């Protein structure tokens, strides 16, 4: 019932479940935290910005890797108007045989890609599932830099 | 071990084990005292 809202002693003394709920919803309101100065505020915001950019780059790297690994980017290059892009494969134990058959695309059940990443990456000059892997590797390196 | 075994190795791992340990840690942390 203590020590969770480390940034707020008023919440940490709450004997109810409201402390847990308000601890989540006030975690990023740095200006209202206990023992707070402006320098610490700007420094924490700066570090949070770095972590956020790292998260964005990791998300993009994950999209690239999953298109390279479980997608049909190379097949979509040769026939972009008939082949439907694949986002990533599906492994869900709750599937029946009918669901597996219906979601089956090429070798495994997979989700069609509605993000338009296939067309975007094709336009900027990507033609191989090894070009996407290089992008994922580089973006994970950039995320490490930002962290 | 082929690459197609990775989903069956990772999806249960992440989607069940990570919730369990994360719940353990979060409950322990939010139920601490001083």
């Amino acid at each position: 019932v203590y020590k969770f809202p480390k940034f707020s002693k008023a919440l940490a003394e709450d004997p109810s479940t409201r402390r847990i709920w308000y601890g989540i919803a006030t975690a990023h309101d740095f200006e209202s935290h206990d023992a707070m100065t402006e320098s610490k505020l700007y420094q924490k915001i700066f570090a949070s910005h770095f972590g956020h950019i790292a998260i964005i780059f990791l998300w993009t790297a994950g999209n690239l890797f999953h298109v390279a690994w479980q997608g049909n980017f190379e097949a979509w290059i040769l026939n972009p108007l008939k082949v439907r892009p694949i986002a990533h494969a599906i492994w869900d134990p709750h599937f029946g045989q009918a669901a597996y058959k219906a979601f089956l695309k090429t070798s495994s059940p997979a989700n069609l890609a509605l993000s338009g990443v296939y067309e975007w990456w094709y336009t900027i000059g990507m033609r191989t599932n090894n070009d996407l892997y290089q992008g994922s590797f580089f973006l994970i390196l950039l995320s490490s830099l930002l962290l | 071990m082929s690459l197609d075994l990775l989903p069956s190795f990772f999806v249960p791992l992440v989607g069940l084990v990570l919730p369990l340990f994360s719940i353990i840690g979060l409950f322990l942390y939010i139920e601490k005292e001083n």
Binding site: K3, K6, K44, A47, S48, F50, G51, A54, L58, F65, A68, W69, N129, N130, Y133, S136, F137, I140, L141, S143, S144, L147 | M1, S2, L3, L6
Partner: peptide, 30 residues
Amino acid sequence: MIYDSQVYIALVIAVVASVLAIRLGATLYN
């Protein structure tokens, strides 16, 4: 089709990015 080595080293590099993330997470304090 990417190889096992390609996926494995990407997983290893992802682990390194994870240790860098907790270091940033712990440095942003409890």
